[PDB]
Design a protein around this ligand. Structure first.
Ligand SMILES: [Mg+2]
Ligand SMILES: [Mg+2]
Ligand SMILES: [Mg+2]
Ligand SMILES: [Mg+2]
Ligand SMILES: [Mg+2]
Ligand SMILES: [Mg+2]
Ligand SMILES: [Mg+2]
Ligand SMILES: [Mg+2]
Ligand SMILES: [Mg+2]
Ligand SMILES: [Mg+2]
Ligand SMILES: [Mg+2]
Ligand SMILES: [Mg+2]
Ligand SMILES: [Mg+2]
Ligand SMILES: [Mg+2]
Ligand SMILES: [Mg+2]
Ligand SMILES: [Mg+2]
Ligand SMILES: [Mg+2]
Ligand SMILES: [Mg+2]
Ligand SMILES: [Mg+2]
Ligand SMILES: [Mg+2]
Ligand SMILES: [Mg+2]
Ligand SMILES: [Mg+2]
Ligand SMILES: [Mg+2]
Ligand SMILES: [Mg+2]
Ligand SMILES: [Mg+2]
Ligand SMILES: [Mg+2]
Lengths: 187, 147, 52, 104, 128
RNA sequence: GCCGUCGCUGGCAGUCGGCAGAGCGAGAAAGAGAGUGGCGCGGACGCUACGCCGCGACGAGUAGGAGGGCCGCUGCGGUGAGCCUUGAAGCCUAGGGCGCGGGCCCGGGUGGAGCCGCCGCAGGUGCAGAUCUUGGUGGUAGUAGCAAAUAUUCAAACGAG
RNA sequence: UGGAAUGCGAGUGCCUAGUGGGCCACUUUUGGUAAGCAGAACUGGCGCUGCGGGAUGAACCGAACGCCGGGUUAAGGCGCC
């Protein structure tokens, strides 16, 4: 007998996409090869994000892509997101962008192209940037989901700003006892 | 579908996933929200603060149409008109400002979140926030109150 | 019994609700019946406007 | 009937399954709970930091010039050692050629 | 004089007896089909010495000789002549078994064609 | 030695062939680099990439969780130019086998009219128990027993008795 | 000169079942004449666990378990069984 624990032997991590999409799996075949046969860590990161689930691939808005592609030294670099590029109506002017994405919404496509930009697919990124050179890999906000408002210390604990689960919002819905000192206590 | 669910995997396993000791009994703890001020108090206090008690005034015969007031922030203001409306106004030299009628778009109050483009505009609305009025005035616009 | 975090729910199923379940399997049949009566009414009152 | 009352038996075994972890440490600790009067001034100190921005630029550039100026003005066995040298893929590259030339 | 396979390695079986179910010798209502004993006190489940044995992945067969017939081939059920021709290019590793519900008339053709293609048939002499 | 699990988030798209040139496992970064001046017609296998291959460690399990089932049952959409009176289902079998197993294949017999594989869909889908339901059958067992109220016998007849 | 040794990849988040009768031993220890009694601390067990030894045995001693061949052992043994 060997003195060892086995509860952590199996690592919980995706080796492939749960999706049965045949176009996504053709891109995984592509980047499985590039990640294996090139020393480029960029390929490994993209291969990993192709396995990732829907909530681990948040959409990247147009306004946020412009901000991150406007930092100094990022001129003529292709912005890359393994996800969806959504349009942002709060933007007034779109610059000339070169972007690679899994999906670009219909209105984001017109605005990027109308500014003189180029929209790639990941099979076109490989031919243009086999090792990922001259790229800017970008991610959407992962905690930008309604669930993360409900996580943390339970709402009924001191200095807990977690959001409760209420069927309705209003004066009659979880506001008397425990939420104001006038009714029992507050914390 | 039933073929993908636990029951098919729990065939032959005596207790069916509920244990040999505690068993699956009918209603231990009570039905529904029983015990909220009692044997279930920690769960309610921990996760539903405010649940018990009363706060604030009653209102009989509430009519939610009377308080109808959709709001729009300034950062979405120019989406209510066409794209050519903004560019034509931006490039024109006479200085004419376009009229944006938020009530026609279905909004009543205008709110101040956001920054406007450097472009005069005339905004019609039932209500304005203080900061919305100043931001509209900072670009050379004018606020118009409708009823 | 409540279990960890969740919503407090009050389903209104404390009466004999199964004695008063209204299904909608006759919905296509109603749509055909109402349509067949609009047409038969339009023919009857023609050339007066079918809408009314 | 009567039952057992209390025990901590088996409890340290449970606590150590996922380890008794020490509290997490971050380089910046929150200012919660510090003296309100002290904190009020620390916010006033931070608020007006930009007043002396130009002086810092002047002093920093002055210091850099002086710092650069001074710097610019300022600036086992013989057999086993020989063999370890020859076996070195780079250093012994020419020593190895001499043996090969000698051998032929 | 029968067709021979490309190789005939020794077939090693870890176990040749069947795993008979617990207490299935004592009752007729208990069939010998294996059922994993799950009673609390069950001494077979606890692997007491001298008791009925339990199947576990350790008894698994060598992958190289798994599903291999004693002749060295591997069977493949066929229902007609057309299904038989899939074994044209693997006639040295896979033999043909004709399904039970193929009439005596059709067995003659499947057996006749298999001989032409050098495919071995496990049950060629049936329904004559 | 073999089986599986886990790890290396390991290797393989280079099957780059006569429009040829076979290598990149080796102690120690980065090119089997490119140029400018001083006869035969030949060469195994592979790669369902959800595939295939290598190396190392590991393997107890109630309650309980999860995965994988080319495990099994009934029906529905597709498909198998599927099977079948030259014999379906079902059933039986000291016949031959396969799989760790759930199970399955084939042979022989009986049977007499329908049935199955594969990709998907669906579920009233898997029994040893519940003093479980209904039906059937045992040992007990040719056993307990055919004992309350006094009682029968002779001859003949019919009749197979 | 990543400022003791040694070993080891870590951090983090959601959802979550069963459990919430325990019992035993070395040592410490309360009540009790004591109890295979009742009640605590520490660690380890049995419970959930087979296997060699203690003839037999939940807990003792050795040792923890995929299916095998060879070798060698532990605790225990070597008149015969
Ligand atoms: Mg082991
Ligand atoms: Mg384990
Ligand atoms: Mg685990
Ligand atoms: Mg279990
Ligand atoms: Mg359960
Ligand atoms: Mg039970
Ligand atoms: Mg319970
Ligand atoms: Mg209990
Ligand atoms: Mg229940
Ligand atoms: Mg519960
Ligand atoms: Mg207790
Ligand atoms: Mg037990
Ligand atoms: Mg195990
Ligand atoms: Mg028999
Ligand atoms: Mg008939
Ligand atoms: Mg049904
Ligand atoms: Mg049954
Ligand atoms: Mg039964
Ligand atoms: Mg008698
Ligand atoms: Mg005690
Ligand atoms: Mg128990
Ligand atoms: Mg344990
Ligand atoms: Mg043990
Ligand atoms: Mg003894
Ligand atoms: Mg041995
Ligand atoms: Mg002895």
């Amino acid at each position: 007998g060997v003195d060892i624990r086995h509860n952590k032997d199996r690592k919980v991590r995706r080796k492939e996409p749960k999706s049965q999409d045949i176009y996504l799996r053709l891109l995984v075949k592509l980047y499985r090869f590039l990640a294996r046969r090139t020393n480029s860590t960029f390929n490994q990161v993209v291969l990993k994000r192709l396995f990732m689930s829907r909530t681990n691939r948040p959409p990247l808005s147009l306004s946020r892509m412009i901000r991150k592609m406007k930092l100094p030294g990022r001129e003529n670099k292709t912005a890359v997101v393994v996800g969806t590029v959504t349009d942002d109506v709060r933007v007034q002017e779109v610059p000339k962008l070169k972007v690679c994405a899994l999906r670009v919404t219909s209105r984001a496509r017109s605005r990027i192209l109308k500014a003189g930009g180029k929209i790639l697919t990941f099979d076109q990124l490989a031919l243009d940037s086999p090792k990922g050179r001259g790229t800017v890999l970008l991610s959407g906000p992962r905690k930008g989901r309604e669930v993360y408002r409900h996580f943390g210390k339970a709402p009924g604990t001191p200095h807990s700003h977690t959001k409760p689960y209420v069927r309705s919002k209003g004066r009659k819905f979880e506001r008397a006892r425990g939420r104001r000192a006038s009714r029992g206590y507050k914390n | 579908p039933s073929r993908l669910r636990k029951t098919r995997k729990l065939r032959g396993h005596v207790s069916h996933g509920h244990g040999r000791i505690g068993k699956h009994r009918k209603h231990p703890g009570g039905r529904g929200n029983a015990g909220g001020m009692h044997h279930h108090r920690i769960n309610f206090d921990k996760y539903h603060p405010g649940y018990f008690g009363k706060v604030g005034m009653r209102h009989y015969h509430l009519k939610r149409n009377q308080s109808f007031c959709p709001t729009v922030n300034l950062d979405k203001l120019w989406t209510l008109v066409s794209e050519q409306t903004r560019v034509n106004a931006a490039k024109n030299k006479t200085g004419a400002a376009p009229i944006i009628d938020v009530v026609r778009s279905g909004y009543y109050k205008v709110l101040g979140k956001g920054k406007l483009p450097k472009q005069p505009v005339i905004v019609k609305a039932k209500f304005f926030s203080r900061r919305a009025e100043e931001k509209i005035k900072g670009v050379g616009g004018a606020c118009v109150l409708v009823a | 019994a409540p279990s960890r975090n969740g919503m407090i729910l009050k389903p209104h199923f404390h009466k004999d609700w199964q004695r008063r379940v209204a299904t909608w399997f006759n919905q296509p049949a109603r749509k055909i019946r109402r349509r067949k009566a609009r047409q038969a009414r339009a023919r009857r009152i023609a050339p007066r406007p079918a809408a009314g | 009937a009567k039952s057992k009352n209390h025990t901590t038996h088996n409890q340290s075994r449970k606590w150590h399954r996922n380890g008794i972890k020490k509290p997490r440490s971050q380089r910046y600790e929150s200012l919660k709970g510090v003296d309100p009067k002290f904190l009020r001034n620390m916010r006033f100190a931070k608020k007006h930091n930009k007043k002396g921005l130009k002086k810092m630029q002047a002093n920093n550039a002055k210091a850099m010039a002086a710092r650069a100026e001074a710097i610019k003005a300022l600036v086992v066995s013989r057999k086993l050692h020989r063999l370890a040298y020859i076996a070195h893929p780079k250093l012994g590259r020419r020593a190895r050629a001499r043996i090969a030339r000698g051998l032929r | 004089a029968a067709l021979r396979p490309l190789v005939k390695p020794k077939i090693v079986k870890k176990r040749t007896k069947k795993f008979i179910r617990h207490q299935s010798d004592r009752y007729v209502k208990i069939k010998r089909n294996w059922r994993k004993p799950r009673g609390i006190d069950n001494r077979v489940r606890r692997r007491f010495k001298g008791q009925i044995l339990m199947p576990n992945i350790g008894y698994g067969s060598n992958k190289k000789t798994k599903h291999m017939l004693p002749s060295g081939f591997r069977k493949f059920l066929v229902h007609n002549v057309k299904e038989l021709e899939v074994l044209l290019m693997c006639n040295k590793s896979y033999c043909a078994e004709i399904a039970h519900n193929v009439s005596s008339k059709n067995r003659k053709a499947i057996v006749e064609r298999a001989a032409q293609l050098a495919i071995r048939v496990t049950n060629p002499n049936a329904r004559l």
